[PDB]
Paper text:
In this study, we determine the crystal structure of PafBC from Arthrobacter aurescens in its non-activated, DNA-free state. Three-dimensional crystals suitable for data collection were ultimately obtained using an A. aurescens PafBC construct (AauPafBCΔNC), which was shortened by 17 amino acids at the N-terminus and 7 amino acids at the C-terminus based on sequence alignment, since these residues are not conserved amongst the orthologs and not even present in most of them. AauPafBCΔNC crystallized in space group P212121 with two molecules in the asymmetric unit, and the structure was refined to 2.2 Å with an Rwork/Rfree of 20%/24%. The PafBC structure features six distinct domains, three in each of the homologous PafB and PafC modules. The structure reveals that the WYL domain exhibits an Sm-fold, commonly encountered in RNA-binding proteins, and is followed by an additional C-terminal extension (WCX) domain featuring a ferredoxin-like fold. The HTH domain of PafB (HTH-B) is accessible in the structure, since only helix H1 and a small part of H3 make hydrophobic contacts to the rest of the molecule. Importantly, the putative recognition helix (H3) appears wedged into the protein core, and following H3, a long loop extends around the back of the central α-helix of PafB (α4) and the WYL-B domain. The PafBC WYL domains are located at the periphery of the molecule on opposite sides, while the WCX domains come together to form a dimeric interaction module. We obtained the crystal structure of PafBC in the absence of DNA, in a largely asymmetric domain arrangement that is likely characteristic for the non-activated state.
Residue numbers in the entry: 1 to 65, 74 to 121, 132 to 448, 453 to 664
């Protein structure tokens, strides 16, 4: 079972590595050491693995001139960058990319000693959670809606009166389709082109037409023209952006800056990304792109100019709680949504929520995390077609046209890390054949030998300075012992001291971590091995408080030791950000906005966050961080006032 998955992975890497080809005798020793039976039983299990690898899209070439044969995959290369993914595989891969991104952020903040996202992380461009909630709520309650819409001819801003039939994703971008009562015909609206939040007309009713096909309506959509942007950027900055550059040269007058061109289709999408970069970029052209960036920066300046609301939070007993930090149960359930989403009849929300024993709204939030969170960097934009009608979500299968995707070594390795965490989730009663398994094998071929470290949550070697702590944690877990932990602060000038119940030791991105129930925080935390100052048994048995309580976050989602606590004001349009960042507390504000207290992983990410969201966010406290963000925005704005 597990030995077959691992055996396939090892076989695939051995054949990929050899440029000359390996004979059967060498493969037996390298991969099939486990098989205690001789050539007879191994020979057929080898033949079965060859057949099985071919079904994952790997053709084993035989070079010979019996037992005289040599085998290899990929001919002279040791990677296969091109894979064909089914919709199920692509959706799993989407969750994996989200896990990688959280791992990458933790490592960048933790290993910092002037903000800059790490390699393989780009700003997250996603449809607004609130607008999504409002369309979904409108359809559920059979209410028509109204919203500001910037016209197809980029003409006047215009309020549209719509009966919503469906939401849909094509080319990574989300659309609303519905009956436009002003035109008396159906119309498609790009969410990015809405000027307002959606007002749900809860006094009204409508029925959608029985003969309405959301997939056929959205399939008729034609991709936007690929336009060219001209950008001046600071040297040695904005790595994800430079990955997209079609040309590069020194900037005409500004020292230490480059002039690049990048291709984009939707200018609202590019402007949100570029606003997140603040003063590190200036749009020189085109003007529609430039005006969108300034608007976001300016709307962010103006919100910080607005007077401060009172910092009054309710007792949080009479309020609806924000999204909780994602747990292993939720991750496992989201994997189990995939077969519904790709089945020919799709995912019927009420019926599937009942089946999992959760509310309708809880199930919708699972889906928003999974498929409405945008595409991380290194995840391709032309992989998933999504339709979301009233109570009905389905990822359309384009028959016998698996979309080929190319991954670099780095992108495949990053994704394998997210897949290996998904692969380490608790085993259920019911393995083989799943989409998780198949996309893991395919991405392994795209990473080559780098898959061996990246595709594992346990094999990484241990630096000598960490070996002592690695052995003490290992033994404490095995013997059920509590540990007294002295943990370095980020700067390593101080230590916190605390009793912990060690639970799991695991590696990610060449880093060792241990999950432990911390008796000082009274919750599960995930610590970096290379930040342990010392660990000693304290003579007590593990308390077992981890299994007590309610659920706890999965390992990439626990609050970090280095988090900085920030109080935000959100507009109604941006109210969904309080869920994205698992707000500790919220307070509703008169016009549908809210106060939100959130933990950010690093104070350096905050100005990018605020400028990215272009007026839907402001920092209230602490004052130091608020002004430091206003300076980022002001420095960004002063590039254009000339
Ligand atoms: K090869």
């Amino acid at each position: 079972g597990a030995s077959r998955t691992e055996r396939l992975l090892n076989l695939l890497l051995a054949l990929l590595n050899t440029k000359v080809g390996l004979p059967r005798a060498v493969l037996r020793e390298k991969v099939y050491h486990d098989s205690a039976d001789n050539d007879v039983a191994f020979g057929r299990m080898f033949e079965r693995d060859k057949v099985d690898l071919k079904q994952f899209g790997f053709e084993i070439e035989t070079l010979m001139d019996p037992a005289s044969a040599r085998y290899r995959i990929g001919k002279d290369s040791n990677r296969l960058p091109d894979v064909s993914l089914t919709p199920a595989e692509s959706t799993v891969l989407l969750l994996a990319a989200q896990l990688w991104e959280r791992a990458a952020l933790g490592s960048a903040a933790a290993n910092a000693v002037d903000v800059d996202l790490p390699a393989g992380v780009q700003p997250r461009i996603k449809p607004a959670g609130q607008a999504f909630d409002d369309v979904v709520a409108a359809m559920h309650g059979k209410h028509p809606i109204r919203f500001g819409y910037q016209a197809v001819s980029t003409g006047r801003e215009e309020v549209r009166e719509v009966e919503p039939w469906g939401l849909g994703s094509r080319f990574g971008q989300w659309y609303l389709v519905g009956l436009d009562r002003g035109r008396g015909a159906k119309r498609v609206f790009r969410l990015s082109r809405m000027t307002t939040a959606i007002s749900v007309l809860t006094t009204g009713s409508f029925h959608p037409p029985k003969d309405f096909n959301a997939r056929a309506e959205l399939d008729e959509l034609n991709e936007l023209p690929v336009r060219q942007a001209t950008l001046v950027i600071d040297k040695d900055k904005l790595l994800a952006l430079r990955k997209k550059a079609t040309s590069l040269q020194d900037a005409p007058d500004e020292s230490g800056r480059d002039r690049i061109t990048v291709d984009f289709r939707d200018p609202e999408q590019l402007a949100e990304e570029l606003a997140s970069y603040g003063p590190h970029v200036k749009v020189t052209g085109p003007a529609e792109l430039s005006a969108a960036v300034v608007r976001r920066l300016q709307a962010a300046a103006d919100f910080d100019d607005a007077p401060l609301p009172p910092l009054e939070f309710p007792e949080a007993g009479r309020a609806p709680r924000a999204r909780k930090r994602t747990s292993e149960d939720q991750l496992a359930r989201m994997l189990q949504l995939v077969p519904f989403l790709v089945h020919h009849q799709g995912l019927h929300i009420q019926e599937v929520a009942d089946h999992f024993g959760i509310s309708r709204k809880a199930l919708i939030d699972d889906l928003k995390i999974l498929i409405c969170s945008g595409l991380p960097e290194g995840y391709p934009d032309d992989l998933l077609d999504i339709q979301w009608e009233n109570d009905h979500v389905y990822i359309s299968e384009h028959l016998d046209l698996n979309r080929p995707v190319r991954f670099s070594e780095e992108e495949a390795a990053a994704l394998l890390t997210g897949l290996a965490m998904l692969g380490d989730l608790p085993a259920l009663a019911g393995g083989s054949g799943s989409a998780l398994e198949s996309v893991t094998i395919k991405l392994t071929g795209a990473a080559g030998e780098a898959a061996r470290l990246a595709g594992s949550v346990s094999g990484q070697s241990v630096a000598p300075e960490q070996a002592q702590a690695f052995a003490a944690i290992t033994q404490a877990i095995r013997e059920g012992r509590q540990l007294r932990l002295r943990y370095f602060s980020l700067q390593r000038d101080e230590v916190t001291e605390r009793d912990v119940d060690p639970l799991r030791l695991y590696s990610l991105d060449s880093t060792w971590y241990f999950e432990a129930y911390c008796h000082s925080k009274a919750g599960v935390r995930n610590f970096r091995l290379d930040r342990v100052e010392s660990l000693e048994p304290n003579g007590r048995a593990v308390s077992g408080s981890a299994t007590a309580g309610q659920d706890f976050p999965a390992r990439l989602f626990t609050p970090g030791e280095d988090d900085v606590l920030v109080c935000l004001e959100l507009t109604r349009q941006g109210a969904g950000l309080a869920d994205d960042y698992y707000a500790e507390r919220t307070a509703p504000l008169p016009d549908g906005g809210l106060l939100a207290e959130v933990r950010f992983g690093d104070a350096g990410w905050l100005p990018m966050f605020v400028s990215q969201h272009g007026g839907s966010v402001r920092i209230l406290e602490p004052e130091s961080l608020r002004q430091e963000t206003r300076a980022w925005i002001d420095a960004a704005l002063v590039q254009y006032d000339s």
